[PDB]
């Protein structure tokens with residue numbers, strides 16, 4: 001799918017960044033320790049490692065499984 005507006009409402013299952021890296025799961029603290037967990041943020045759809053925009057960025061993003069790259073925008077297009 002594409003995402004609407006800034007992607008805050010996106011709930012698809014895409015999990016890949018603009019550089020081809022894989023999204024880290026929101027519930028996981030490895031490789032990146034963070035606070036953006038579904039426990040902490042229950043209505044933002046932070047399911048598995050799916051691309052999401054819980055913080056009003058400008059597109060869906062995720063923490064990445066590359067330990068040297070904390071987060072990236074996902075390879076999704078605006079609708």
Ligand SMILES: O=C(CCC1CCNCC1)NS(=O)(=O)c1ccccc1OC(F)(F)F
Pocket residue numbers: 033034035036037055057061071
């Ligand atoms: O490190 C990040 C990612 C921050 C980026 C994500 C893309 N939008 C710009 C900020 N988030 S974090 O570790 O949870 C985090 C770390 C410090 C402050 C806030 C914060 O997010 C939250 F508010 F949820 F606690």
Ligand SMILES: [Cl-]
Pocket residue numbers: 002003004007008009010011
């Ligand atoms: Cl959307």
